[PDB]
Design a protein around this ligand. Sequence first.
Ligand SMILES: *[C@@H]1O[C@H](CO[C@@H]2O[C@@H](C)[C@@H](O)[C@@H](O)[C@@H]2O)[C@@H](O[C@@H]2O[C@H](CO)[C@@H](O)[C@H](O)[C@H]2NC(C)=O)[C@H](O)[C@H]1NC(C)=O
Lengths: 130, 194
Amino acid sequence: QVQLQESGGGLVQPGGSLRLSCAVSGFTLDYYAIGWFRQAPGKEREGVSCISSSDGSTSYADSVKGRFTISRDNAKNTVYLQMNSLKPEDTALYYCAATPATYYSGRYYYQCPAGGMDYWGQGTQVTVSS
Amino acid sequence: NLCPFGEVFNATRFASVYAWNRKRISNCVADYSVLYNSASFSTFKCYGVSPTKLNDLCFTNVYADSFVIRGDEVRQIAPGQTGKIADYNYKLPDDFTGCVIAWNSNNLDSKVGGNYNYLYRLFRKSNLKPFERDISTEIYQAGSTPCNGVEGFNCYFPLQSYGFQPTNGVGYQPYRVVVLSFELLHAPATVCGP
Ligand SMILES: *[C@@H]1O[C@H](CO[C@@H]2O[C@@H](C)[C@@H](O)[C@@H](O)[C@@H]2O)[C@@H](O[C@@H]2O[C@H](CO)[C@@H](O)[C@H](O)[C@H]2NC(C)=O)[C@H](O)[C@H]1NC(C)=O
């Protein structure tokens, strides 16, 4: 039932821009977070940005803060990653992922933990030429 | 009196694995035949003892730990295992003597839209020691950046909801687990079999 499918990416020169898309289909969780992650060669997969399903609150890794924007179109249930001012160090394989929110003591937390994402996409390559 | 094995196995609600419940079972007659001959269990592994040999053994104390995890994680409730559950939630010793019992509880613990009431600890600075419990909820700092509250991208609430849904794959469905721990101390033996 559940499937996340990335689209977008490719090759850009430094300073260029990209828009990644994540089509979320079959999702039935009431409250969840959707995150963009990336894995550079030889390195560990890290989180880049995270968005809440309830009110669209966002958080960003420091390395992309101000350059990357995560957003969701609830109609299409698609999550986007606008990537501006690209640098060679942004080269990686990019994944979107989804995980339930965490409920504790009357409160939900919307987190995108790299080691606890229940659902993953296939990943799309992003290359900044240098 | 017969041992109250039905209170543990047949309770209506199980604890989250990070807050696993421990029931001390002492001073009673334990008919272990009801457990192994139930056929409703999907996992019944014992370590260092056979269920047949348990009907004729005695022990000082028998502990019954119970919780809910995912099906794909039941394999972690075994000696010498690693993973989020074994490292951060419930750790069995390498010399474990006892049985691990699990059954599918998808019908009881799943909800449409998700059951957020079952949680496991996803972040912890150090691995658990055998039979150690941690129910703290301090914000976890994952990077070298300090953590005022969860507001940081690298500052995590350490527990994670499973969000059990009936339409999950069997591996993701909830399973109820009872871990029987057999203790034989140099003291009067209060638990025996038929
Ligand atoms: C856990 O419960 C099962 C089932 O509980 C029975 O059915 C309920 C509706 C309620 O009426 C309970 O009081 C019942 O005990 C137990 O299996 C039952 O075992 C008894 C005798 O031990 C037998 O008479 C029933 O026919 C059994 N019912 C079924 C459905 O198998 C089981 O023994 C309990 N486990 C433990 C460890 O006590």
